[PDB]
Structure formats: C-alpha cells, structure tokens
Amino acid sequence: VNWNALRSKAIEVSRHAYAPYSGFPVGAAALVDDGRTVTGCNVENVSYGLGLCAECAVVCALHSGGGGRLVALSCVGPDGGVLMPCGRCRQVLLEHGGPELLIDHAHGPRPLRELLPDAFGPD
Amino acid sequence: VNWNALRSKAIEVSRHAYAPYSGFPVGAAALVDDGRTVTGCNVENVSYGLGLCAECAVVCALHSGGGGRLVALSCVGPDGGVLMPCGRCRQVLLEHGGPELLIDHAHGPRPLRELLPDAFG
Amino acid sequence: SMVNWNALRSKAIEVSRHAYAPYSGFPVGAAALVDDGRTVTGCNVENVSYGLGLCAECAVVCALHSGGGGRLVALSCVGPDGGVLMPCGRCRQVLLEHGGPELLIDHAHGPRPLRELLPDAF
Amino acid sequence: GSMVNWNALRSKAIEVSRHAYAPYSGFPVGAAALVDDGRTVTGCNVENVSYGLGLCAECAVVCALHSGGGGRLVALSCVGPDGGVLMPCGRCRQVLLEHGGPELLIDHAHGPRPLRELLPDAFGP
Ligand SMILES: [Zn+2]
Ligand SMILES: [Zn+2]
Ligand SMILES: [Zn+2]
Ligand SMILES: [Zn+2]
Questions:
Q1: Which of B59, B119, C1, C60 is least surrounded by CB atoms within 10 angstroms?
Q2: Distance from the CA of D76 to the center of ligand 1, in angstroms?
Q3: What is the third-level CATH fold of B1-121?
C-alpha cells in the first residue's frame, strides 16, 4: 500500500466536497484488491440526516466500478489531516473490506477490527 | 437527452448492485450539465438502514468527478423497468438537479418537482 | 374529520422544545394522531456526523411502534415559532409506511394527504 | 454497572422487541437504556420498503430520550429475536456516543463495557 498516494488522492477529492451546511469538507480514497483506487467526498443535504459521508461515496464507487474488496482507506479532513470514519462508515466499510481493511489514522494506519470491535454482523 | 442510452447505462451498472438482503438490484444513470454521464447502483448493509440507494451513488459520483448539476436521471429495477426514486432520493436529487431535473418514467420523463412538491428546503 | 389540528400542533410545538439540534440551531417537533386515539410525539436529534441525524417525524414513527403499534392518521410538524413545516422526502417515505397515502399532513392552506406530497411512491 | 440492573434492562428490551416493525428482515430488535434521571427509555427497530431508511432500536431509544425530557444515557441493552444480547451497529455506536459519551455502558454477554471500547478513537467535536 502506497499511503502517501492514498492521502494525496483523498486531499484531491476533498476539494470537490459538497458540505455547505457544516463547512467541513472530507475526502476519502481506497485501494481495491484489483489494484485500482476509488475516491469519494462528502455530500450534505438540507435535511441533515440525508448527508452522505466520503467513505460511503468510496463504497458506492467500489461497486459501480465493477466490485471487489477494499484493502486500505485514507480519509482526510479540511486541513489535510487524517480523519477517523464515523461509526456508520465503520460498519459500511466492514461489509466491503472486513476486519483486516487498513484505515489511515493521524497516528498511523490500523485494521478496522481495532476501530469496530465485536461488530454487529451476519452471524 | 438520449433516454434509451441512460436506461442501458442504468441496467449495465445495476449488474454490480450489492443487494444480497433484498435481492432487488437497482441501477441509476444521469447526465450532468458538463456532458458527463455518472452511474450508481444500490449497496445494502447488514444493518438495513445503512443501505445506500443507486441515486445516492449517482450524487456521490457527481461531486467526486468534479461537480456540476444533474439534468436527467434514469433508474431501473430487476426487470429493466424504470423505477421512481424513493422519497429520500427525491430529496437528495432535488439538491443537485433542482425541481426541473428530469426523471425517466415508462412513457416519458417528468420533472422532479412533480415527484416532490412543496419540498422541504 | 374529527382531527383536532390545533391540539396536534400544540403537541408538536411542546415536543419541539426538547429537540437536540445544536448543529443547525433549528429545533423541530412533530405530533401524530394514531388510530388507537393516542398522540405520539418526536423531536429532531442531530449528530456530529450530519448524515446520522434523525428527523422529528422519524422519532414519531419510533414512538408509534415502541408504544404498541398502529397506524398514523394525521401529523403536524413545526418549528419553534409554531410555523408548520413540510416533511422532507425521507420522512415522506417513512411516514407512508405507517400511515399510507391518506395520512393527513398539516399545512398552512389546510392539511394534505401524503399521496399528494409523495406521488407514485416507491 | 457495576451495580446497574442489567436484568431489568434486558427484560424491558425483550418487551419492546415484541413491537418491532421488521417485516423485511424478520429480525426484530429491542433496546432499553437507563437515563441519569433514573428512568428507562425503550425502542424497537422500524424497517422501511426502502431499506436504507430503516431505523435501529437504539435510534428509537435516543429519540425517546429527548422527546421524553432529555438527559444522558448511563446504560443500554440491545437484544435480538431470541432474547440474547446484541452488539449495536456502527451507526448506533456513533449516535449513542453523542448522548451517553465514552463511558456509556453497553450490555455484552461477556460483561458490559464502555462504549469507547466498542468505538475507539471516535469521530467527534
Ligand atoms: Zn461517516
Ligand atoms: Zn432511494
Ligand atoms: Zn425528515
Ligand atoms: Zn444500529
């Protein structure tokens, strides 16, 4: 995994974020197991609860671009600093990357199982 | 607008739907005012209420791909027939295409304002 | 026909005061008459992750079921000033599930059936 | 709790689970939470034809917390269709954090635990 490449891509996509309500743009980029990179940015709505996270966008692109499994994900905030996925995104990411999906963190990447232990699941 | 081409693109992307819980795959394709076509398919979750609609995916792609406005959207279901967006998606689409956004229907498109009148805003 | 809209609005305004809406600054309340004669209420509950926000009308549906089920007959949604609000598209779909097309939604110009607000619904 | 009455919360969660609106999954869920004013609030899941518009039992708990007069959540039990303890989904972990904080105790068959253990390094303010 080229983490510097992922962060660069997440910063690039964050410039397109639609976040006029919070003023808090977010970019995300992930490496897929087929070797391609997908990206996403947050898209807010006037009804706050219909807002889509950057990580949600990533998962949508994973599938629209032909499917696969996520291997690694970086999310970056307004200043370029690495951000932690919200709990909804942690659950959504788990479905498409599993516990071993690597998630970037301001203090170093780590597996999703560490960030969503004992997850709700199909079992 | 080439509606036939939007419908075919919608069917094509629906093939990648992640809908193992409902078994109801959905695809959507939209023309953007910059001339791009963007696509999306539904992605369900084990926690049902975390599922994402195809139309949400379209709006994500709109912005990750540089922004713009939606001009036309076609949504298709399992039999390839045209579907109306759910209420959430009607609200989400309004933000990015306005009331004039054209929504595919079997006998011709109609504006989104007809599908979501007096819209919260 | 027997719906007391003034009373339902008053319940919505009352519950609005308990809203958790620190990010928008805009509290919303909703109240609904159920076919068992009770009034259920709900207020918006926003979240730091904006897209995890719950609308007042969603809260009404939760209360409907936690309190024993039923069907919604009429619903009023308001801001703090008591001004009537239109449910957002998500809430129109959620409300359809529990009230159907004939559920009455409060509106300045007279209540409107949900089917007028969400035609040809998914 | 260590002295929280988990059996009382579990019983209330099972009670409320009977009223779940889950015809799509056939997976009814109930949840009950102690508030810091000593009352219990409950909720059950409410699914939708558009699957992504489904509301979790724990969401319903948080709604009732506020509509019922506010407060902070102290302890929460979620139970599944068999009456056994269930882990909240990640969305619910995030929502619950807003209304109980990191020290909110979540029921777990191995011993209840703070929400921070289940959502470490949470996205927040
Ligand atoms: Zn998120
Ligand atoms: Zn939808
Ligand atoms: Zn709403
Ligand atoms: Zn949940």
A1: C1
A2: 23
A3: Cytidine Deaminase; domain 2 (3.40.140)
